Design an enzyme around this catalytic site. Structure first.
Site, PDB file in Angstrom:
ATOM      1  N   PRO A  32       0.824  -1.270   0.041  1.00 17.87           N
ATOM      2  CG  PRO A  32      -0.969  -1.578   1.399  1.00 17.87           C
ATOM      3  CD  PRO A  32       0.204  -2.292   0.956  1.00 17.87           C
TER       4      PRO A  32
ATOM      5  CB  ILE B  22      -3.140  -4.313  -5.881  1.00 16.84           C
ATOM      6  CG1 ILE B  22      -2.077  -3.530  -6.736  1.00 16.84           C
ATOM      7  CG2 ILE B  22      -4.141  -5.149  -6.897  1.00 16.84           C
ATOM      8  CD1 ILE B  22      -1.009  -4.342  -7.339  1.00 16.84           C
TER       9      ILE B  22
ATOM     10  CE  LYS C  34      -3.545  -5.670  -0.681  1.00 14.69           C
ATOM     11  NZ  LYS C  34      -3.245  -6.423  -1.929  1.00 14.69           N
TER      12      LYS C  34
HETATM   13  O1  LIG Z   1       5.420  -5.306  -3.678  1.00  9.89           O
HETATM   14  C1  LIG Z   1       5.299  -3.947  -3.668  1.00  9.89           C
HETATM   15  O2  LIG Z   1       6.096  -3.470  -2.626  1.00  9.89           O
HETATM   16  C2  LIG Z   1       3.765  -3.679  -3.332  1.00  9.89           C
HETATM   17  C3  LIG Z   1       3.144  -4.079  -4.400  1.00  9.89           C
HETATM   18  C4  LIG Z   1       1.679  -3.988  -4.261  1.00  9.89           C
HETATM   19  C5  LIG Z   1       1.231  -3.022  -3.285  1.00  9.89           C
HETATM   20  C6  LIG Z   1      -0.151  -2.827  -3.118  1.00  9.89           C
HETATM   21  O3  LIG Z   1      -0.963  -3.317  -3.763  1.00  9.89           O
HETATM   22  O4  LIG Z   1      -0.521  -2.052  -2.160  1.00  9.89           O
HETATM   23  N1  LIG Z   1       2.286  -2.462  -2.417  1.00  9.89           N
HETATM   24  C7  LIG Z   1       3.514  -2.943  -2.604  1.00  9.89           C
END
Ligand SMILES: O=C(O)c1ccc(C(=O)O)nc1
Ligand SMILES: O=C(O)c1ccc(C(=O)O)nc1
Ligand SMILES: O=C(O)c1ccc(C(=O)O)nc1
Lengths: 117, 117, 117
Positions: free
Chosen positions: C1, C64, C32
Site C-alpha cells: 500500500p 491493489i 497487506k
Molecule cells: O511489492 C510492492 O512493494 C507492493 C505491491 C503492491 C502493493 C499494493 O498493492 O498496495 N504494495 C506494495
C-alpha cells in the site's frame, strides 16, 4: 491452551475436522504441545459483530504465561487470523479474539489443580 | 536463488506453470531477477509433516547474502507461505521452509565458480 | 500500500515515529504485509480543510484490490480515523481520507513492474 470459538455459521458451513486442526495451529502459534490444546466450537449461534449479523466468529484463548502482553498477543493474533479467515471463509473484519491469562491454581485436572502436579 | 519444493501432492494436483510463477514470486520476495531464479519441484513423494501424512510441502531456499538473518527470513517466510498456500491449496500448518546461506565459491556456473565471474 | 499524509502541524507536533506506527496500522487495516506498506508524512504545510486553516491532516491511500468498494473503505476509514485522531491529537472533523485503487502494471519495483513479479 483453552480455545473457545463461537460462530453464526451453521455446523454444515464449518469444515469437518476444524477442532483438530485448531489444536495443531494453536500448538505452533502459542508454543505448547498439541496434546495440551483444548478446543470448543459452538456453531449455529445468533451473532452480531460490529453491529452486523453477517457470518462471523469470536475466539477466546486462555493460557498460562504466553497471552499476557500486547507484543506476544499481536504475534498470536496475526497467526490465528490467517488460520481462521481461510478455514471459515471469513474476512478479517468478521473475526475478533480475546486473550485471557490463567494461573495454575485455576486449572482443575485429574481431581486436583495444576499447582500440585 | 535456489528453491527446492518437495510435496506429497501428486503431479496432477500441482498447478501447471508453478515453476515460472515461483521464479517471479522469488524475484519480488528476495530482490534478485527472475532470470536468476532456479526452481526444482518434486511431487508425488511420501511425506509426513508434524507427524501427519495429510497433504503438505517443504521448501528449501538458498542464496548469497539475503537468507542469513532472522529478520530477513521472517519477512521472506511470510511471503513464501502466502504464495504456496494459494498455489497448493494448503494451510500454513502444512508447509515448512528451510533457509541456507551460500557463498560464491560453492556455486559452479559455466564450468567455473561464481568467485571468478 | 502507498499512504501519503499532508499536515499543517509543524514537524515538532507530529509524534516521533508516527510513520512507523502508521505503517503497522495500515498493514493491519488493509490486510497487506507491513514490508509492503509505504508511508510518506509531509508536515508544516499551509492547509485549509473543510474551509478552515485550523490544524488538520489529509491522508491518501492507494493499493491493489482492497480499496475499491464503499463497504471495504467504510471499514478502513473507521480504523484510520481511530488511529490518526489519537496520534495527531485532532478531532474527527480535521481529517479526510481519499482511496485510490491501483493495478499491477502501475507499480514499478526492482526495475520492472509488479505484473512480472
Ligand atoms: O511489492 C510492492 O512493494 C507492493 C505491491 C503492491 C502493493 C499494493 O498493492 O498496495 N504494495 C506494495
Ligand atoms: O492441562 C491442561 O490441558 C492445560 C493446562 C494449561 C494450559 C496452558 O497454560 O495453556 N493448557 C492446557
Ligand atoms: O547463477 C545462479 O543461477 C545463481 C547464483 C547465485 C544465486 C544466489 O545467490 O541467489 N542465485 C542464482
Amino acid at each position: 491452551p483453552f480455545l473457545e470459538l463461537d460462530t453464526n455459521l451453521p455446523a454444515n458451513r464449518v469444515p469437518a475436522g476444524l477442532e483438530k486442526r485448531l489444536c495443531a495451529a494453536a500448538a505452533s502459534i502459542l508454543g505448547k504441545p498439541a496434546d495440551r490444546v483444548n478446543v470448543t466450537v459452538r456453531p449455529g449461534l445468533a451473532m452480531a459483530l460490529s453491529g452486523s449479523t453477517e457470518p462471523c466468529a469470536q475466539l477466546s484463548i486462555s493460557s498460562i504465561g504466553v497471552v499476557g502482553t500486547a507484543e506476544d498477543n499481536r504475534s498470536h493474533s496475526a497467526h490465528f487470523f490467517e488460520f481462521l479467515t481461510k478455514e471459515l471463509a471469513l474476512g478479517q473484519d468478521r473475526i475478533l479474539i480475546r486473550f485471557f491469562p490463567l494461573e495454575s491454581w485455576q486449572i482443575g485436572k485429574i481431581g486436583t489443580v495444576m499447582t500440585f502436579l
